[PDB]
Amino acid sequence: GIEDAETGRTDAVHKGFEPKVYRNIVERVKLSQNEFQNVTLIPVSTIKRRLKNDERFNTQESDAIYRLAMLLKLATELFDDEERALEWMKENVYGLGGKRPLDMVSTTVDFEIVKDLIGRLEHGVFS
């Protein structure tokens, strides 16, 4: 249950996400550097500096990226389709008070709220 050989998910965040992770995410979620900054609160200059110097993202930045990737995973599990997961991630949600799920990965509180919403939807619990 470990990614690669020892990276896993916990060790990956503290070791530091490689910029390839950011590249794959920005290609899969189809969001610009400004939109990535908006969802993860990671400065645009920081992203450019990581990409050019081939420097891995730090642990708080990697934790932000992790919350976003976990949102992608949970939504794809919800819809059994990545495209519908993305549409819903960019869609305003009544259970989030009108905020889209992408706006709910900046902190851990919003991330817990959206995770519980996804669980309720899976199990048909009323919100």
């Binding site: 919800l78 819809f79 059994d80 519908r84 549409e87 819903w88 869609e91 949600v93 009544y94 259970g95 989030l96 008070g97 709220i113 995770k115 519980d116 919403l117 996804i118 669980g119 309720r120 939807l121 899976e122 199990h123 048909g124 619990v125 009323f126 919100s127």
Partner: protein
Amino acid sequence: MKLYRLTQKKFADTPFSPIGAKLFGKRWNSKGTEALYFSESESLCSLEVFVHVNNDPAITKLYDLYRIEMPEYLIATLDEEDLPVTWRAIPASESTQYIGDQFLNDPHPEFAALQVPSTISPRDKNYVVNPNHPKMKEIIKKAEKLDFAFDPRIFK
């Protein structure tokens, strides 16, 4: 009374497990409290879930609808005065959580379900059911799996 529940097809082996309520329920219960959620009608049941995914007009294909007959004698009713003002807040108030918890964790349970007002339409009532009630297994045995007739294209 005819009560309607829905859950994703992947859970067909255990449709009435209170696990979703325990792990993710925020409105009428808090984490760890066992509960089941039903609605008076198929439409309200469908809305409660599908409003958050109203972008998908084929959401029904991921879900399964079930119906039960709840005896009238074990359905209890709340009062609006006990209900707080923030009961309809999207950040679910802890007051509704604890009213539901008190009903659900109550030992010696005389009633099996509590009538609560829907967050979408308060005059139409959802029902929160305690699985720990004695006369519930039978109700689960008599449950009927339905095909969805509600139209998700309502959300365009």
